[PDB]
Every structure is written in C-alpha cells, then in structure tokens.
Symmetry: D2
Subunit: 385 residues, 4 copies
C-alpha cells in the first residue's frame, strides 16, 4: 500500500498547513512554508498540490513580492516533479467577504471578487492547472430577509458567465468545478448539495465549461449518500474533480482524514470511482486534528493515501470474486442494466404480460437476496474471505 505519483493523489496547501485555529481555540502549530509542504508531500508519494491564491501569495502583497513567492514555488515543483492540477480563490477569509463574494449584497464587493478570481485564473494556467474550483463558502444567509435567493442566483449566474467569457476570450484550456456545501460558515449556503449545483450549471450560457467538485463530508452534513451523489454526477458527465475526507455524520465539518468517518461509504465510493474509470485527481481536503504536532500531520496525510489504496484492493477483490458475480445475478443487477421497454411504447401497451396477465403475487414473493450480497461485501472489506 505504498503510493506512487501514478495514483494521482493530491493535497491542498491549506490541509497539511492548517495551524489548528477553530471556533474556540488558538493555533497549535506554526505556519508551514509552501516550499516545505511540497517537498514533504513529494517524499510521501503525492502527485501534486493545490492552492488558494492567498495560501501562496499573502493577501496584500506587491507585484515584486508576488513574483518572488511564485518563483520560489515553481522551483520547488521543478525540484520534486510535483504538479499543480487545480487551483482556487479565497473568497471567504477577508472581512470584505462577510456577506459573500459573487452574491454579496454590495455591488462593489461583487466586482472585486470577480477581479480577484480572474487574477488567479491567469496564475493557475501559468502553473498548469486544468481545473479551477469555486467554493462559495460565504454565499448564503443566517436569516430569511437578508438574501433574496432568486436575485442571488441571478448574480451567481452572472459571475460564472463572465468567468466563462474570460477563459474563452483568452483561449485557456481550463474548466470550472463548483463545490457545494450545505452550511458552515453561513447558516445556509447557496447551492447546498451536488444536485443543486448540477441543476444550476444547466442554466449557464456555456454549461460544457462547468462541472462539480463534491466533497465527502459536505454531502454527509446533509445526511445524504455520497456514492449516490457521485453516481449522479458521473451520469451527467460532470465529475471534474473530487475532495476526499471523512465526517462522522450531521454536525460541524470535521475534515477528518480519508477513511475515517463512514468507512463503508468510503469503500463504496472507491468501488464506484475505480469501476467508472474516473481519471481525475484524488484530492484530499482534510485537516490534521489540532491535537497533533508535525509528525502527526504527516502521519495523517500518509493515512489518507494508505486507506484509499486498501479500499481499492478490497473493492477490486469484491468485484472479481466469482461468488460475488453469482450473487449480483441472484439480486438481478443484470436485469437493472437492461432496458425496460426497448420494444417501444405501443408494444408495452399491447403486452398483456405487463399488466392484464401479470402475476403480482408470484413477483412479490421473489426475494431480492440483498443481505447475502451485502455480507459478502462486508467480508471483502474486512479481509474475512
């Protein structure tokens, strides 16, 4: 279970660089220089790193300070062979974004947010990113009267449309990925789940440029099934990126290392990504707990990759087991994949076997055999086959 760069494991600078400040506590770790994080992640077998603008260039920097920060970063990438497959903008930390960026009630803040984003799209392309993520963490409300959501969705569509116009006019080869979250830090966030994000995208001027970046813990904060949501994003052709972590149910976002939280969900998620041939980055958006020193930060990071690789082994074993393939036929997964009425509507209507002569009692008596199938999955996960 040793990772190599071909496994496409990536990490944000803000993940291992989290200093441990929380709602009730000061930092427990000092700040990490991005150059150090690049070197240490390369040693652990990572493929690449991601960044918000402000992780890499401290807010307020001059053009000369900005150039120095980039130069040093690019040298660390050259020294390690690390890639940058994705970048994003910080439109949530600075006080100016307290009511949002793209959907701030103040128009001047909206225009600023757009300019800050465009400046970092340029840098992202320079560094070789192919996906630009957008997490609207401040887009929302704590109270009903503060945000007219129809107007806010008009302003969110206006912003993404302008960004699509910019990337096309410049000829860049980069696509956008919208990251939903249901709440935190706002009491409710706009586009709160994968579904809302998918639906919004279909009303953009150039929908082909936009997909989703779902995060395990975010969908779990709404109690939803994360592998099901990913299945719908794949079905729509919109899974452009994914953020992997863990979460123990409906509560604050924990950002535990991947494999922690709902372990069975993590197994079915890896089964799906590997079966569907997802070829994008396996990005970990996690926070080493603030109980840990730097040795525990790197242990937590290594654990993310290790657990993905164990689960991949076990899901492949499950799908290759002749006994499991028999069990899938016993539960009629083969029949689910066949069309209901390839013969057409008129044929269906004239088929007495579909209604007038259908024996509903015979059909109802047939067991689905799902519990034997799920115990074989459990036995495979635990290495008890």
């Amino acid at each position: 279970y040793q990772p190599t760069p071909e496994d496409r494991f990536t990490f944000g600078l803000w993940t291992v660089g989290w200093q441990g400040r929380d709602p009730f506590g000061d930092a427990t770790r000092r700040a990490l220089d991005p150059v150090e994080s690049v070197r240490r992640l390369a040693e652990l077998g990572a493929h690449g790193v991601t960044f918000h603008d402000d992780d890499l260039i401290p807010f307020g920097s001059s053009d000369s300070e900005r150039e120095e920060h980039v130069k040093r970063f690019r040298q660390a990438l050259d020294d390690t062979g690390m890639k940058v497959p994705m970048a994003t903008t910080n439109l949530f930390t600075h006080p100016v974004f307290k009511d949002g960026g793209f959907t701030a009630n103040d128009r001047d803040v909206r225009r600023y947010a757009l300019r800050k984003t465009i400046r970092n799209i340029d840098l992202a392309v320079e560094l070789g990113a192919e996906t630009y993520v957008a997490w609207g963490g401040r887009e929302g409300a704590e109270s009903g009267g503060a945000k007219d959501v129809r107007d806010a969705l008009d302003r969110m569509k206006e912003a993404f449309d302008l960004l699509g116009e910019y990337v096309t006019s410049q000829g860049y080869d980069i696509r956008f990925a919208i990251e939903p979250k249901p709440n935190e830090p706002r009491g409710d966030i706009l586009l709160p789940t994968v579904g809302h994000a998918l639906a919004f995208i279909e009303r953009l001027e150039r929908p082909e440029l936009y997909g989703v970046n779902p995060e395990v813990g975010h969908e779990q904060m709404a109690g939803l099934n994360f592998p099901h949501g990913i299945a719908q994003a794949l079905w729509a052709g919109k899974l452009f990126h994914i953020d992997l972590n863990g979460q123990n149910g409906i509560k604050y976002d924990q950002d535990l290392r991947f494999g922690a939280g709902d372990l069975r969900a993590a197994f079915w998620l890896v089964d799906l990504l590997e079966s569907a041939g997802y070829s994008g980055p396996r990005h970990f958006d996690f926070k080493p707990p603030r109980t840990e020193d730097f040795d525990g930060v790197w242990a937590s990071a290594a654990g993310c990759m290790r657990n993905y690789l164990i689960l991949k082994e076990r899901a492949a074993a499950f799908r290759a087991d002749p006994e499991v393939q028999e069990a899938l036929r016993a539960s009629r997964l083969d029949e689910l994949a066949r069309p209901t009425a390839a013969d057409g509507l008129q044929a269906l209507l004239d088929d007495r076997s579909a209604f007038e002569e259908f024996d509903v009692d015979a059909a109802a008596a047939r067991g689905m055999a799902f519990e034997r199938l799920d115990q074989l999955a459990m036995d495979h996960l635990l290495g008890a086959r």
Copy 2:
C-alpha cells in the same frame, strides 16, 4: 382567517383518510369513504382533493367495480363544486414494489409499474387534473451493492421519457411533477432533494413537461432550507405543485399539519410564494396524529388552512411596512437586484475602482444591518408591531 375556494387549498384523500398505522402501532381510526372526505373538506372551505389510484379504486378491482367507484366520486365532486387538480400513482404499498417501481431490479416489475401509471394518467385527465405527481418512494437502497445508481437513473429516465411520449401521443394537457425525498421508506431514495430532481429533469427528452413537487418536511429531513430550495425551483421555472406540512428537524417524516414544525420557515415560505405570484394549488400532504379521533382530524385540517392565512397576512404586512422597506435598503437588498457588470467584461477588467483602487477596509467595515431587519420580521410574525 376563513378559507374560501379561491385560496386554492387542496388535500389528498390519504391525508385526512390516514387510519393511524405506524411502524409500531395498529390503526386508531376506521377507514373514510372518499365521498365523505370530499363533503367534509368542502364544508371546511377547501378548493379540491387529490388521490392515488389505489385511494380511489381498491387494488385488484374489476372494471365494473372501478366504474362504480369513479361514478360515486364524480357525483360528490358535482354535488360540492370540488375540483381534482392533481393525481398520482401508488407505486409503494403493494409488496411487488418492495425494490421500487420504475427502478426495480426485476424488469417485469418495471413494465408493470409503467402500465399501472398510464392507466391512472387516463383517469386523471378525465377528472380534470392538470398535474400528475410522481413520488418514487421505493426507488433506492438499504445497501451499496443492491442498486447500481447509474443504471437506475437510466431506467428512471427511460420511464419518464415513455410517459412523456404517451401524454404527447394522446394530446393530453397535463404536466409531471417529481417529488424528491431523501429517505424513508428506503434507506436512501434516488433524487433525494429538489436540486437532484431539477438536475435529472434537464436530461429528459422533453424537459418542458416536467417540474418538481417539493414537500416542506422532505427537504427538512436533510436539514436544508426549504424557502431556499423553492426559490431555486422558481428561478428555474419548475415549481409546478407544492406539498405543505410540518416537520421538527432531522428525524422520521412526521407529516405534521402546516404551521407546526419550523414556524419561521413557514413564514418565509409563504412570503416567497405570495411575492413570486405562485398560482398553483396549496396542497396539504399531512397526517392528523393517531392520537386524534375524527373531530381532531377535521380540526387539524382546518388548522392547515388557518395557519397559511395568518402567515399570509403577516408576510404582506412585513413587506408593506415603510420601516421594513427602509431596512431592506439599509441592508442593500436593492443592490443585490442590480447587475454586477452590465458594462461587460472588458469594462470590468479596465475599472481601477474594482481592484487596484478598491478600499477593502472601508467596504469591510460596513455593517449589513441584518439583525435589525430580522427583528422587524419577528415583530411582524408575532403581531408585535
């Protein structure tokens, strides 16, 4: 707060007719004849009733028994002036639907579900319904291996496409409304929220025929904000119907009368529907608690309509108050409604006032004034102005 038929309040036969059977308990009330429910609801000031096929025609009935049941129902409608604006199919009670209807793993069950649906679309049109609802309550899974969700979504698209082909071929003037729910009775249900349903619709062959039927309590079982979800459905032009009830948070579906549960949410929901000019039925999909006799059933029903009408009064008072209109301008709701960059992308990029000369500290210091606005809303809700 006396309702009249012009208020467009409707009720399902299964709501006031719920006999009180739950996971742990037998029925506490005897069955109601649909004719009685029509008469009693008319006396309370309702506009109309809705039905599943099997609420009106007991499952397994002959064509002669079916005709007698319809004849008697139509006479009660004629005797009272009650309308039938919506109908739906029961694809969840009979054992044959234990793994679903449209997405059952068994193909023969899928074909049966379609034929049972088409038979009731014919009856719905005969009785004058303009919306046909589809709640896939059995579409889903308790375990990961039982349902390949990509295949299931193919089968769900195939079914809705065939239904769209049927209504077009027959020339009917009826539209479909998909009702999402996150779980119960399946451990996870497919299309679990308004967003997932909206996104699915955009992949149907004839998307214009399909909208959503959201239910208050269903979105609340995922902890989501129901007025926000409705705002997105309106923004997409897909709010074809709505189910009104109450729910106390993330737990089993309670189906409390409307106004119970999250009262502030109910206020912001009525504010939105009335402001947006929603002209569809105000449908109550609720269950009088099984502690009640028939006097309490009718009291609970009357309470649904009463609470809508109080909330409508209070939301209109809130929006008409000069002090509230001032407060909305103080919180920049006016600026939210104005375009971010009507001047265009190039103008935005050349505007030094949007970035190079923007004072982020001045902008960050401006309070949003949302708490004074929300206390005026509270004072209006409570009649404390």
Copy 3:
C-alpha cells in the same frame, strides 16, 4: 467465525419474525410460528430468544389458549437447549396505548398498562429470564401542550416504583432495564438517551433494581457516540443488557443487522464490551429488510453473529499488538488512568509546579500522537497489519 451458545448471542422473536410492514407498505413475509424461529435460531448457533408478551400470546387470548401457547414454546426450548434471558411487555401496538402506557394522560390506561406488565413479569420468571426490559415507545408527545413532562416523570417513577415493590414482595430474582430512544413513534419520547435514563433511575425508591438497555441505533438517531454512552453506563454499574443493530446516521430507525451502519463504531463497541468483561447477553434487535424472503432473513441473522465475531478478533489483535501498546503510551493513555491529585487538595495548592512554575508552552507543544494510533486501529480493523 462460527458462533456457539457460549457466545451468548440472543434474538427477539419480533426480529426474524418481522413481516415487513412499514409506514408506506404492506407485509412482504408471512408470520413465523415462534416454535419455528426457536428451532432455526438454534441451528444458527444462537444461545437464546427474547419476547414481548404479545409476540408469544396473541392479544386477547383466553387462559387455555395462553397455556397452550406457553406449553408449545417451552417444548421447543426443551428440544433445542435455547434459553430465555430477557422478556418485555408490548405497551405500544394496541390503540389503547396511543398516548402511552405508564404516562398516558388517561389514568385508567395507566392502571391497565401496569397490570399487563405484572402479568408478564410472572411468565418471564417462570421461563427463567433474569432481565425485564421496558421500552416506553409511546411515552412522549408530538406537541408541547399535550404532556406536562414533570407530571409525566412523576407517573413514570410511580410505575417503576410499583413494579419494584411487586418483584420484591414476590421474591423474584429479576432486574429491570430501561431502554431509551429519542423519537419514533412519538415525535419526542421521554428519557430519550442513555444519560436521561441513568439520571431518572437515581430517583427511584430502589435504584439497585434498575439499569439500562441501550440500543446502538437509538443513540445514533441523536448523533451521539454509542461506545461513549456505554462507557458511562458501565462506569455507573448499570449496563444490564444491550441491543445490537446498525443505523446510518440521523434518520428513521433502520434496525439494520449488526455491523451495518457505522462499522468503526461497531469495532469500538466490541473492544469496550470485551475489555470491560461484559457478561450479559449479546442481543440483536434488528429487522431483516423487507426486500428479503426467508432465506435472506436467516442470512441477515447469521450476519449479525458473524460480524460480532470478526470485530472481536480484530479488537483483541489491536489490544495485544506490542506496537499498539507502545502507541498507547506515546499518547499518554497510561497517564489518563493515574489520579490527578492523589496527594490531596492542600498539596495541589502548594505545588508551584502546577501553576506558578508550569511551562504552558512546553506542554502545549507536545503532540498527542492520536492519528498514528488511529491508523493502527484502522489497519487492524481491515486486516492490513
């Protein structure tokens, strides 16, 4: 992973006998004769069965019919060597209990509930049960004004006190176990968690006769940590019985087979029970999903026992690993077990090393090493050591 009767695995008659009726669906399985369930569970390696009165003697039976039902049951126990370690009363299915049993607002219902309970305590002792469980599934409310909770707790204390007086007067060797649940079927149930139940017990006349019967899924419906709750019940000396199942988070009670739901929680629960030397029954209170026929019912039951035995192996391996014992010392679990101030209060106050000369920065810099410890636990659970 073959179970034997020494593993003390037990099952309720209502578990494998669940016919599959849910809020939205009719039964999918026919009724099982208790004699058949006893025989089939013995073949699977169970130790014993449990029962509600009404599972064994249909409600309304005569004394002669009651004697016949018991006689046949006792013969099946004699024929198989199965035991009955626990029994309980059904105070939730019949309509008379729609507002509760012990805390029904109607006094005559309260008195009936007590008499029905006492009649079955007699039978429980005759059959050899040592624990009598009480699940107040109807004790609670859907609305605030319906139940004065102080008065209700007086009536619940009065009922348990009378039951304690009965068992002492008759000289029975049986103890009571109160089963908390937060909601379902009532909108909120009284004594909703292990903690509330433990606190209530300390106000009974004879607290030594009463403990708790916690259920995995019940505490999980409140988002709580089930191994922590059991740890507190053990610490108080009140873990008299336990109900094992699975649950996927905060939603309706699923009653999945044990090992399903939160698998990591199930691992830490078995670690604790085995480490603490819990010697009581391992009782499964689960429902085979209504998708299954009878072959799937017995597969689901076997799976309960299998998963407990795998988890027991893995938790014992974890605790016996020298590397894990080193890791426990690295995270100071040894120091947690030592007294804070065995030297006493005055010594603590005079110790300059506890405040005046304490280096808070040195202490704050020490990492806890919890993530390496938790990755060793994960590696042990998955068989990746």
Copy 4:
C-alpha cells in the same frame, strides 16, 4: 416589551464582545473593553454580566495588571448597578488545553487546569457570583482509541470532587453548574446532554453542590427537545442556571439571538420557566453574526430580551384563557397530574376494573384532542386570538 433589571437578563462579556472570527474567516469587529460592554448593557436594561477569567484578565497577566483590570471592572459595576451572578473558567482557548483540561491525558495539564479554576473561583466570590459554570469544551475525542472514557470520567469526578472540597473548606456560598454539549470543538464531548450531566452528578461526593447549566442550542445539536430536558432538570431540582440562544437544527453551533431558530420551542421553554417559578438569571449566550457592526451587536442583544418578553406575554395569555383551560381538561392533563395507584399495589392487583373488566376498545376510541389544543397555542403565539 421594555426590559428592566428585575427581569434578571444577563449576558456574557464574550457574547457582545465576539469579534467575529470563525473557522474560515478573520475578525470583522474590533475588541470591546469590558467597561464599555457593562455600560452599554446597563443602558439596554440588562441586570448583570458574566465572564470567563480570560475575558476579564488577559492570559499571562501579572498580579498588578490583574488588580488594575479588576479595579476598573468593579468601578463600572458600581457606576451602573450591574451585578455578576455567574462566572466561569476558560479551559479551551489556549493550546495547552487541546486534549482537555480536567480530562487531558497529560497529568500535569490536569493539575494546571484545576489551579487555574480555583484562582478564578476566588475572584468570582469576591465579585458576588452565586453560580460557577463549567463547560468542558475540550473534554472528548475525535477518535476511539485516544480517550478511555471510564478513565476520563474518573478524572472528571476527581476534579469536581476536589473543587467541592475547596469551596467547602473556604466556606464559600457558591454552587457549580455543569454545561453539556454534544460536540464542537471536539468530535464528541463527554457528558453530551442534560441527561448525561444529571447522571454524572449523582456519583459526586457532594451532589447537592452541583446542578446543570443547559443551553438551548446545545441540546438542539442532538435533535433533542429542549423544554423536555429542562423539565427533567427541574424535576430533579438541578436547574441552577440556563443559557438562552437560538439554533436552526442539527449543524454547527450557531449561537443565534434568543427567539431565532426554533421559535415554537422558545415559546414552550418560556411557558415552562415561568410556570415553574424559575428564579435564576435569564442568561444569553449568543454571538451577534459577523455580518454586523456595533450597531447590529446592540440591536441583536436588545432582541434577545425583547423576544423573551413577547413570549412571556403570550404564554401567560395562553395559560389564563378559559378556553385553553377547558381544552386542557378535554385532553386529560388534569388526570396526568393525579396518581396512578394511590390505593397501593395490592389494591391495583385486586381491581377487576384495571384488567379483567377493562374495556380496551372504549378507551382506545377516545380521542386525545391534542390538535385543537395545539392550534389554540399557535393562535396565542401569533396573537390570532
């Protein structure tokens, strides 16, 4: 709805002084001098203020700086007539407390936490506080192996016992109030609800010195009913203090102003406190949202008191309405308050009317009339009577 000091409304210094730092954002407001907060709260009609040690004396201060800070604070109290009814310790912000205070795995940290607490108990008594609150916000775990909960509860009992020994030895007239919370900032916190706290108290050496300080939003983060929990704390005689705020369901702790969140819960909470004659402080533990400037901070604070006073009016009107008193008798709330079996156990057993001659069908047919009662409560809350 003008508050006066006789209404006993109090506020923590940390509430209106919250600068707006959250998991994802920097501060939006500058720090408030405690002297200013005392003066501004007095102008709004508050009765008093509360404090953590470190709110009033910056961490690390010298004895001379400490004396200056106290002197200035006491002058502001003298200048305004504000009281200090409660104080508490900060055992959660400094990095040294990252694994807890009283239950830290490191013994030296445990001893430090105790000394820091005792130093502030002395100051609390000097300033006239009668209640000392203890919120163990860092007592818990993110992972199963990190904390043996039986050992941790031994260390938590040891700490409270030592504190009880200190206050008795010094002869102070002050009592302790334990504040439960289910999670945040730890993934699970020990003593997560009112019930767990009540049960723990009964195992302390001197239980009479300890009660609970429940917080609205904390019990709501577990989906529990807050008025029910308070009813149990009152029933045990352990409601020593209460923290009032709002929360929108199961999610991160929002700390909204009181009246926001679950408004119907807030109504039933005020009904109960006033009916039970709770004579303690009405303490608001809330955070003005970080969207607000200082004008919005004071508006939010005023709103807390205003909403309590509206709800008090409406609950008193509800209880005084002859129609509601009739409705309470119709739902048998009178019978709930009468003993079940004052005649004794033997009389109950010999009463044929309690079992042999009880008509369960007649009793089951009686409706409870709860929905008419709850619509009268709603009409009273909304001022629609």
